[PDB]
Amino acid sequence: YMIQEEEWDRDLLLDPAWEKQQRKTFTAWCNSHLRKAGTQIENIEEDFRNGLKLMLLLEVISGERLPKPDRGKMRFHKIANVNKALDYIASKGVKLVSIGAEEIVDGNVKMTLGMIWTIILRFAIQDISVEETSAKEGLLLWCQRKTAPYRNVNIQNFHTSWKDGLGLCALIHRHRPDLIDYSKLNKDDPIGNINLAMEIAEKHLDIPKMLDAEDIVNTPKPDERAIMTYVSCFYHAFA
């Protein structure tokens, strides 16, 4: 059988940029909450398949108890646990499309990422409201107001606007000028600018280093779900 197939099989071990980014960011986001429950996940495509840490995540971020988990390794107990996590998200206003317990238990990557995004959106971004603007659009207007003074920043979206890292440094500088010497930063060191903001955010604001920096700089259009997840932590930290 052909060498050509074998080489392309190996090539499937590279995740597309959008997955790398969502994987890194949504894993760190889940972990910055699960640590209040004394646990962590390591691999987002594997560690929600039994429904247990998913139910716990939902409890930690909602503050409300979910019904008791099924105990037992049998596959229908994992299905019952994930159904409880998804029924709880539904009950909180999220209309789920193309997402079901069966594919989550089977490790479906796009579906598992999509589910976690619906959680991040509902419990971190949905209720953001600035000047009669809610959710994604409200978080964006917020970023625009905070960064308006900064002439080397133009927040117009949750992707390309954020590539050079200056948008992140400005959000910090506006709220905490003591923490950053903004005037010394420029557009030629985007990787530096990103890792700097993330290092400052981690040390002083308790926000883990969620972003895939290399991919943000090098990908034509960064993943906006990942960037919204990270920026949503700055909003909660500053408001």
Angle at 230 between CA 43 and CA 158, to 5 degrees: 115
Helix, strand, or coil (residue 130): strand
User: Which is nearest to 17 in space by CA: 165, 225, 212?
Assistant: 212
Show which of 131, 151, 167 is a domain's final residue. 131
Contact 21, 216 (CB under 8 A): yes
Alpha-carbon dihedral of residues 44, 48, 52, 57, nearest 10 degrees?
A: 50
Question: 180-199 burial, b if ≥16 CB within 10 A, otherwise e?
Answer: bebeebeeeebeebbbbbbe
Neighbouring-strand partners of residue 129: 134
| H-helix or E-strand spanning residue 7 | helix 3-11
Q: Same domain, yes or no, for 81 and 9?
A: yes
Distance CA 238, CA 140 (A): 15
Contact 120, 229 (CB under 8 A): yes
Q: The domain containing residue 215 runs over which residues?
A: 132-239
Resolution of the experimental model in angstroms, please?
Answer: 2.0
Q: What is the DSSP letter of 214?
A: H
Show which of 131, 155, 185 is a domain's final residue. 131
Q: Same domain, yes or no, for 120 and 185?
A: no
The CATH number of the domain holding residue 72 is 1.10.418.10
Contact 145, 129 (CB under 8 A): no
Angle at 49 between CA 44 and CA 54, to 5 degrees: 70
How many residues belong to the chain? Answer: 239
Q: Same domain, yes or no, for 17 and 88?
A: yes
